[PDB]
C-alpha cells in the first residue's frame, strides 16, 4: 500500500512549456492525499487550478476493499492513465500518466498538454478561485479497464463557474479482481483545498468512493 | 409538500406517437417516489427504460432543508423543466415538463420527443435491461435557475452498457431561497426499480441529495 | 416542388413564451430561400439570430437530383424534424418541426423551446451580430432517416464568436430513393443575411449541397 | 513551400505501444499529399484507419493565398498541434505534433495515445473499412491560434458508420497574417485513399479549403 509519493508534470499550455516537481503523502486507509509542487521554469502563466487533477488514486480504498487503482499499486503491476479535459471555453487539456512503485512510495511522471485557452479567459488571466467538489462516475467495461467521467467546475472571480468535462481511461497491466468488477458503477466524491503562489502549489485532497448511499 | 402525483407523457419516438398516463405517490421526507403508467395507444415500440427519467423532484428534500424543486412545489410557484438526453448512439430525446399543484397533489404534463434511435439499436429492439444507479451534479447559476447534468447508462442484454448524458435546465417562477443558493454544487444519488410489460411501466425511485460525504 | 412557404414558430425562451408568424418564397432549383417573420406577443427578449435556423430544406436540391427533403416535399409524404442545439454557454434549444404541403406551398409548424441562456450572455443581451456561414455533414443511417450535424457560430459585439453544435434528426414517412442513399456523406454549405428589429426578422438564406469538391 | 516530408508516430493504443515511420510528398499548390508508413514494432493490433489523421496541413493552400499552416511552414516559424478525437465508443485518441523544416522538406514527430477502445469494437477488431470524406470548420480566435473541428466517420464491415469528433488546436510561433485572419470561418474538404497491410499503411489525401461556394 502507498504511503508517500512524488510527481513530475511537464508539457505545455498554449504552446508555452512548463515543468512542475514535488512530493507528498497519503493515507491508503481513507483516500486522503496531500502534495506540494514547485515550478522549475519560472512563474506559471496560467491558473494553478487546472493543474489540480494533474497533481494518485492508488490512495483510494473502496468500501468493501481496495480500489482497482490501489490494488494495482499494492500489486506493483500498476496502470497507465489517459485523461482528456474539455472546457466550455473550447480549450483542451490532455494528460498521460505513468507510475513507478517502490515499497509504499509512488513516483509519478505526468505529460500534460493544454491548448486553446482564450487569452482573456479565466485560465490565462488566473481568475479561477478554486476547484468545486466533484463526484466521478466509474465503470469497468472489461477486466483491464476503468473509465471515469466527471462534470467539473471552478468558480471564477466574477462569481460565475467555469465548466469542463473530464474523461479518464485507466489501462491496467493485470486483470482487476473479480470482486471489484462485480460492483458497478462506483462513484468517487472529491474535495480539494489549495494554497498557491506563482511558482508553488499546495494541495490537500479528500476522496471517498461509494456504490450506494 | 407533495404526497401524491400523476403524469401524462405524450410525444413521439422515431416519428411514432406514443402516450402514457398514470399516477403514484412519494415521501417528501426521504425522496422516495413510485408510479405506474400505462400506454393509451397500444404496445410501446421502444425500450421502457428511456421513459424512466421521463416518469418529480418536488419529493426531493435537502440535508439542511428543502430542495429548490420541493420549495417551489410547497410554494405553489413551481418551475418548468427542459431536458436534453443525448445517447452515444446519436439518438436525441427532449423533454418539456410542466406541473400543476393542488394540496399535496402534483399533476405533470410531459412533452417528450425522441429521434435517431437505430432500428437495430438497444432502444428499438428493447435490449436494455435496467437503468444504472446515477449521481447528478447540480448548480444554481442564478436565483431562478437550476442546472443538472448526469452521466447515464443502461445495461443491455449483451452485457455492454448503453451510454447517454442528461442535461436538465430548471426555470423557476420565484427566486430560490438564499439558503439553498449558498450550498453548491449539490449532488443527487438515484436508484430505480422497474417492472414493465408492453403497455405498462411500474417505477420505484429513491433519491438522496448531498453536499458533503 | 416547393415555391412558397409560411411558418409559425411558438414556444419559449428561458421560460418566457414567444410566437412568430410569417411567410416567404424559395427557388427549389438553387436552394435559395427568403422569409419575413413577425412577433405576435410583443418585442422579443432574446437575440433574433438564434431563430435563424428555426425559420425549409425542401428547397434544397442535390447535384444529381433532389435532396431527400425536396423529394419528400414533391412527394407529399414529407418528414418530421427533431433539432437539438447546445450552446457553449450551457443553454439548450430544441426544435420540433412539422410541415403541410399544398401545390408548391409549404406550411410549417415549429415548436421551439430554449433554456439556460445566461442573463448576461450574448443571447439575452442581444449581443450576437450575425450567423456565420456553415457547412453541415449529413448521413442517411437507414432509408427513413437523415442525420445532420453542424459546428455553428455567431459573432458577438465583443468580436468573439459564440459557439454551438446543431444536431438535427429527420424522420421520413416514405423510404428515401435508393439513388440518394447511395451518395454519403452529403455536405450542405449555407449563408444567411439578416435584417431585424424587435418584432420583425427578415431572412435570406442560400444553400448548396455537395458530395465532392 | 513544402515539397516532401517524413513522419514518426509513436505512443500507444489501449496500453500497447506502437511505432510508425515513413515518408512522402505533397503539392503545396493543390493540397494533395501522399505518404507510406511502416511499423517498427511488429503488426498493428488496431485498425489502421484511426492513424489516417495522425499521418501535414502545410501543403494546404487557401483560395486567396497560403493557409496559416503553409505560411508558417514557408516562414520556418511553424506551429505545434494538439488534437483530441473522441469516439462514440468512449475511446479517446490524443495527438501532439511538432515539425521541423529544411528547404521544402518537413520532418514530423507525432506523439499519439489512444485508450478505451472496446475489445469487441470496430477499432480493435479491424472492422473499419475506410475514412469518410470530411469537412472541417476552422476559426482563428486570435493571431496565434487556429481551431478546427470535424464530425468524423469510418464505415465498418457491418455497414454501420463508426462516429467521432475531432478537435484540433494549432498554436503558432509567429502571428498569422492579417489577410488570413480576415476571412472566417474557413472550411477544408478532405478525401483519403488507403491501402494497408498489418505493418504498412499507404495514404493519399486531397484537401481543398474554401470560404464561399
Coordinates of N, CA and C in Angstrom, one line a residue, chain A residues 29-122:
Chain A
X29 N -5.9 4.3 3.8 CA -7.0 3.9 4.6 C -8.2 4.7 4.3
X30 N -8.1 6.0 4.1 CA -9.2 6.9 3.9 C -9.2 7.7 2.6
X31 N -8.2 7.5 1.8 CA -8.1 8.2 0.5 C -7.6 9.7 0.6
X32 N -7.3 10.1 1.7 CA -6.7 11.5 1.9 C -5.4 11.5 1.2
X33 N -5.0 12.7 0.7 CA -3.8 12.9 -0.1 C -3.4 14.3 0.0
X34 N -2.1 14.6 0.0 CA -1.6 16.0 0.0 C -0.3 16.0 -0.7
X35 N 0.0 17.2 -1.3 CA 1.3 17.3 -2.0 C 1.6 18.8 -2.3
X36 N 2.9 19.0 -2.5 CA 3.4 20.4 -2.8 C 4.2 20.3 -4.0
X37 N 4.0 21.2 -5.0 CA 4.7 21.2 -6.2 C 5.3 22.6 -6.5
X38 N 6.4 22.6 -7.2 CA 7.0 23.9 -7.5 C 7.5 23.9 -8.9
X39 N 7.4 25.1 -9.6 CA 7.8 25.2 -11.0 C 9.3 25.3 -11.0
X40 N 9.8 24.7 -12.1 CA 11.3 24.7 -12.3 C 11.6 25.5 -13.5
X41 N 10.6 26.3 -14.1 CA 10.8 27.1 -15.2 C 10.3 28.5 -15.1
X42 N 10.2 29.0 -13.8 CA 9.7 30.4 -13.6 C 8.2 30.4 -13.2
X43 N 7.7 31.6 -13.0 CA 6.2 31.7 -12.7 C 5.3 31.1 -13.8
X44 N 4.2 30.5 -13.3 CA 3.3 29.8 -14.2 C 2.4 30.9 -14.9
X45 N 2.3 30.8 -16.2 CA 1.5 31.8 -16.9 C 0.0 31.4 -17.0
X46 N -0.5 30.5 -16.2 CA -1.9 30.1 -16.2 C -2.4 29.7 -14.8
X47 N -3.7 29.6 -14.7 CA -4.3 29.3 -13.4 C -3.8 28.0 -12.8
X48 N -3.5 28.0 -11.6 CA -3.0 26.7 -10.9 C -4.1 25.7 -10.7
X49 N -5.3 26.1 -10.8 CA -6.4 25.2 -10.6 C -6.6 24.2 -11.6
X50 N -6.1 24.4 -12.8 CA -6.2 23.4 -13.9 C -5.2 22.3 -13.6
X51 N -4.2 22.6 -12.8 CA -3.2 21.6 -12.5 C -3.6 20.6 -11.4
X52 N -4.6 21.0 -10.6 CA -5.1 20.2 -9.5 C -5.3 18.7 -9.8
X53 N -6.1 18.4 -10.9 CA -6.3 17.0 -11.2 C -5.0 16.4 -11.7
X54 N -4.2 17.2 -12.3 CA -2.9 16.7 -12.8 C -1.8 16.6 -11.7
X55 N -2.3 16.7 -10.5 CA -1.3 16.7 -9.4 C -1.8 15.8 -8.2
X56 N -3.4 10.6 -7.9 CA -2.8 9.5 -7.2 C -4.0 8.7 -6.5
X57 N -4.7 8.0 -7.4 CA -5.9 7.2 -7.0 C -5.5 5.9 -6.2
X58 N -4.2 5.6 -6.2 CA -3.7 4.4 -5.5 C -4.0 4.5 -4.0
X59 N -4.3 5.8 -3.6 CA -4.6 6.0 -2.1 C -6.0 5.8 -1.9
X60 N -6.8 5.6 -2.9 CA -8.2 5.4 -2.8 C -8.7 4.0 -2.4
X61 N -9.3 3.8 -1.3 CA -9.8 2.5 -0.9 C -11.3 2.4 -1.3
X62 N -11.8 1.2 -1.4 CA -13.2 1.0 -1.7 C -13.9 0.6 -0.4
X63 N -15.3 0.7 -0.3 CA -16.0 0.3 0.9 C -15.7 -1.1 1.3
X64 N -15.7 -2.1 0.4 CA -15.5 -3.5 0.7 C -14.1 -4.0 0.4
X65 N -13.2 -3.0 0.2 CA -11.8 -3.4 -0.1 C -11.0 -2.4 -0.8
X66 N -10.0 -2.8 -1.6 CA -9.2 -1.9 -2.4 C -9.9 -1.4 -3.7
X67 N -9.5 -0.3 -4.1 CA -10.0 0.2 -5.4 C -9.1 -0.4 -6.4
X68 N -9.5 -0.5 -7.7 CA -8.6 -1.2 -8.6 C -7.2 -0.5 -8.7
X69 N -7.2 0.8 -8.5 CA -6.0 1.6 -8.6 C -5.1 1.2 -7.5
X70 N -5.6 1.1 -6.3 CA -4.9 0.8 -5.1 C -4.4 -0.7 -5.1
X71 N -5.2 -1.6 -5.7 CA -4.8 -3.0 -5.8 C -3.6 -3.1 -6.7
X72 N -3.7 -2.4 -7.8 CA -2.6 -2.4 -8.8 C -1.4 -1.8 -8.3
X73 N -1.5 -0.9 -7.3 CA -0.3 -0.3 -6.7 C 0.3 -1.3 -5.7
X74 N -0.5 -1.9 -4.9 CA -0.1 -2.8 -3.9 C 0.5 -4.0 -4.6
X75 N 0.0 -4.3 -5.7 CA 0.4 -5.4 -6.6 C 1.7 -5.1 -7.2
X76 N 1.9 -3.9 -7.6 CA 3.1 -3.5 -8.3 C 2.9 -3.5 -9.8
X77 N 1.9 -4.2 -10.3 CA 1.6 -4.3 -11.7 C 1.2 -2.9 -12.3
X78 N 0.5 -2.1 -11.5 CA 0.2 -0.8 -12.0 C -0.8 -0.6 -13.1
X79 N -0.9 0.7 -13.6 CA -1.7 1.0 -14.7 C -1.3 2.3 -15.3
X80 N -1.7 2.6 -16.5 CA -1.4 3.8 -17.2 C -2.7 4.7 -17.2
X81 N -2.5 6.0 -17.3 CA -3.7 6.9 -17.4 C -3.7 7.8 -18.6
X82 N -4.9 7.8 -19.2 CA -5.1 8.7 -20.4 C -6.2 9.6 -20.0
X83 N -6.0 10.9 -19.7 CA -7.0 11.8 -19.3 C -7.3 12.9 -20.3
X84 N -8.5 13.2 -20.6 CA -8.9 14.3 -21.5 C -9.9 15.2 -20.8
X85 N -9.6 16.5 -20.8 CA -10.4 17.5 -20.2 C -10.8 18.5 -21.3
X86 N -12.1 18.8 -21.4 CA -12.6 19.7 -22.4 C -13.4 20.8 -21.7
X87 N -12.9 22.0 -21.8 CA -13.5 23.2 -21.2 C -14.6 23.8 -22.1
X88 N -15.6 24.4 -21.5 CA -16.7 25.1 -22.2 C -16.2 26.1 -23.1
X89 N -15.0 26.5 -22.8 CA -14.2 27.5 -23.5 C -13.7 27.1 -24.9
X90 N -13.5 25.8 -25.0 CA -13.0 25.2 -26.3 C -11.6 24.7 -26.0
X91 N -11.1 25.1 -24.9 CA -9.7 24.7 -24.5 C -9.7 23.2 -24.3
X92 N -8.5 22.5 -24.6 CA -8.4 21.1 -24.4 C -7.1 20.9 -23.5
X93 N -7.2 19.9 -22.6 CA -6.1 19.6 -21.7 C -6.0 18.0 -21.6
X94 N -4.9 17.5 -22.2 CA -4.6 16.1 -22.2 C -3.6 15.7 -21.2
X95 N -3.8 14.6 -20.5 CA -2.8 14.0 -19.6 C -2.5 12.6 -19.8
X96 N -1.2 12.3 -19.8 CA -0.7 10.9 -19.9 C 0.1 10.6 -18.6
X97 N -0.4 9.8 -17.8 CA 0.4 9.5 -16.5 C 1.0 8.0 -16.5
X98 N 2.1 7.9 -15.9 CA 2.8 6.6 -15.7 C 3.4 6.7 -14.3
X99 N 3.3 5.5 -13.6 CA 3.8 5.5 -12.3 C 4.9 4.4 -12.1
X100 N 5.6 4.5 -11.0 CA 6.7 3.6 -10.6 C 6.5 3.3 -9.1
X101 N 6.6 2.1 -8.7 CA 6.4 1.7 -7.3 C 7.6 1.2 -6.6
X102 N 7.8 1.6 -5.3 CA 8.9 1.1 -4.6 C 8.6 1.2 -3.1
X103 N 8.2 0.1 -2.5 CA 7.9 0.0 -1.1 C 7.1 1.1 -0.5
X104 N 5.9 1.2 -0.9 CA 5.0 2.3 -0.4 C 5.2 3.7 -0.9
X105 N 6.2 3.8 -1.8 CA 6.5 5.1 -2.4 C 6.2 5.1 -3.9
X106 N 5.4 6.1 -4.3 CA 5.0 6.2 -5.7 C 5.7 7.4 -6.4
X107 N 6.2 7.1 -7.6 CA 6.8 8.1 -8.4 C 6.0 8.3 -9.7
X108 N 5.4 9.5 -9.8 CA 4.6 9.8 -11.0 C 5.2 10.7 -12.0
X109 N 5.0 10.3 -13.3 CA 5.6 11.0 -14.4 C 4.4 11.4 -15.3
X110 N 4.0 12.7 -15.2 CA 2.8 13.1 -16.0 C 3.1 14.1 -17.2
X111 N 2.7 13.7 -18.4 CA 2.9 14.5 -19.5 C 1.6 15.2 -19.8
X112 N 1.5 16.5 -19.6 CA 0.3 17.3 -19.7 C 0.4 18.4 -20.8
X113 N -0.5 18.4 -21.7 CA -0.6 19.4 -22.8 C -1.9 20.1 -22.8
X114 N -1.9 21.4 -22.8 CA -3.2 22.2 -22.8 C -3.1 23.2 -23.9
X115 N -4.3 23.4 -24.6 CA -4.3 24.4 -25.7 C -5.7 25.0 -25.8
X116 N -5.7 26.1 -26.6 CA -6.9 26.8 -26.9 C -7.5 27.6 -25.7
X117 N -6.8 27.9 -24.7 CA -7.3 28.7 -23.6 C -7.3 30.1 -24.1
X118 N -8.5 30.8 -24.1 CA -8.6 32.2 -24.6 C -7.7 33.1 -23.8
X119 N -7.0 34.0 -24.5 CA -6.1 34.9 -23.8 C -6.8 35.7 -22.7
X120 N -8.1 36.0 -22.9 CA -8.9 36.8 -22.0 C -9.7 35.9 -21.1
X121 N -9.5 34.6 -21.2 CA -10.3 33.6 -20.4 C -9.8 33.5 -19.0
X122 N -10.6 32.8 -18.1 CA -10.4 32.6 -16.7 C -9.1 31.9 -16.4

